């Protein structure tokens, strides 16, 4: 803001693994303030991915979230007044903070008989750098390579 | 008739719910199960206030 | 052998919000005016009346092939028209405040004469500031090309 810059409150973990990432992940996986069966959807995706790609959760989930990370990414500041979409850096907080959101923007598009059933495949996709979150990453890196000269 | 351009025309059965069954010549092959026959045609056979309900429903 | 007419001196004057593409009904002796390119859409604003829209004031001039004698009038309350599901709601839009709806262009598409329709706002107006944002954008981008490059 302007007057008092604030630092965030600290992190309280989630039950099964105690993970400070996944506790903040159940909140983006939370709609209407309900953690209850939202974390059942989380552990449903954690049942499916940590059996369809091998290793135990607390490391094996991180492969796709490593791969969908940005290096440089765009925003607008009116460097002209047109849509000169300015590319810019990113703090490592915001790296993961929008990297998880690029998973949930793909979670809002899948089509099984249950949304807990829906998320069986996106992290095993983006581990191999396929899917739709890597299409989002490819879009933002395409725009990054496009507007590179604007510095 | 001409010998060529007219379809196969045989007699099939036709039963109805009026007791009057008839089997005549048509084009399909299976029993044309009838709806209503000409005697059970409701011409002289079908068409041949609630004050009391007001006292019925309460008083 | 006439091209598309216009009444361009309205668009940077009023507010245009939502647009509709009418038809007409030409009333007896005065069509080749449009065929030749003689027109006057000066201050043509559709007074909604009787559920039956009219153009008034517009001086479509008589021709000279049709003898100028038993011709109709230059100005006439000419009965405009337009489809019911497009007409039958705009009364609630237009019948509130100092609004009229104007004519825009007596063009012709589909080999057929037309008139455009768009809801307007007012004239009792400091009509400055979006004629000011143009010179507070052009000069601003020149100034910031100067700043970013230079």
């Amino acid at each position: 803001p302007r007057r008092r810059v604030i630092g965030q409150r600290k992190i309280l973990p989630d039950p099964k693994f105690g993970s400070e990432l996944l506790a903040k992940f159940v909140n983006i996986l939370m709609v209407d303030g309900k953690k209850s069966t939202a974390e059942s959807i989380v552990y449903s995706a954690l049942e499916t991915l940590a059996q369809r790609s091998g290793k135990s959760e607390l490391e094996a989930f991180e492969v796709a979230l490593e791969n969908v990370r940005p290096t440089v990414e765009v925003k607008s500041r009116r460097v002209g007044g047109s849509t000169y979409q300015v590319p810019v850096e990113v703090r490592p907080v915001r790296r993961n903070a929008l990297a998880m959101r690029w998973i949930v923007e793909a979670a809002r598009k899948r089509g099984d008989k249950s949304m807990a059933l829906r998320l069986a495949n996106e992290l095993s996709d983006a581990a191999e750098n396929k899917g739709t979150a890597v299409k989002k990453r490819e879009d933002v890196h395409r725009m990054a390579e496009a507007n590179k000269a604007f510095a | 008739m001409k010998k060529d351009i007219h379809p196969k025309y045989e007699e099939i059965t036709a039963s109805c719910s009026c007791g009057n069954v008839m089997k005549i010549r048509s084009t399909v092959g299976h029993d044309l199960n009838l709806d209503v026959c000409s005697k059970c045609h409701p011409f002289f056979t079908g068409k041949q206030g609630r004050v009391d309900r007001f006292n019925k429903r309460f008083n | 052998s006439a091209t598309i007419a216009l009444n361009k001196r309205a668009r940077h004057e009023y507010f245009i919000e939502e647009e509709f593409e009418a038809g007409l009904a030409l009333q007896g002796w005065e069509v080749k005016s449009l065929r030749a390119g003689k027109a006057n859409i000066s201050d043509s604003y559709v007074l909604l009346r009787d559920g039956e829209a009219f153009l008034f004031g517009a001086n479509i001039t008589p021709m000279a092939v049709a003898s100028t004698h038993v011709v109709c009038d230059p100005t006439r309350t000419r009965k405009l028209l337009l489809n019911q599901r497009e007409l039958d709601s705009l009364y609630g839009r237009v019948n509130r405040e100092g609004y009229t709806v104007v004519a825009l262009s007596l063009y012709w598409k589909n080999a057929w004469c037309k008139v455009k329709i768009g809801v307007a706002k007012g004239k009792k107006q400091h009509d400055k500031r979006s004629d000011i944002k143009e010179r507070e954008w052009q000069v601003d981008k020149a100034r910031i090309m100067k700043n970013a490059h230079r």
Binding site: - | G49, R50, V51, F54, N55, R57, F58, N59 | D50, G51
Partner: protein, 83 residues
């Protein structure tokens, strides 16, 4: 509607003249201002002229009208049509 165990509501002296109408069976159109009741079972086919604000509207009762009221028969919504 009303709860059905009541026994519906008409005027006292106009019920007396309904009983006069069953007693008579006469065929006179009387100027009448009652609207807050039902077309009863035992008031079959006698004509009067009911209030509708300013004019007076004739109504003919029907023995198929023992569920409704006698207040829809007077439109006081001033409606000639739209335009």
């Amino acid at each position: 509607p009303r709860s059905l165990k009541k026994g519906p509501f008409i005027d006292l002296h106009l019920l007396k003249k309904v009983e006069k109408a069953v007693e008579s069976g006469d065929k006179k159109p009387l100027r009448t201002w009652s609207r807050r009741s039902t077309i009863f079972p035992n008031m079959i086919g006698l004509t009067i002229a009911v209030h509708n604000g300013r004019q007076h509207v004739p109504v003919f009762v029907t023995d198929e009208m023992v569920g409704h009221k006698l207040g829809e028969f007077a439109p006081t919504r001033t409606y000639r049509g739209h335009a």
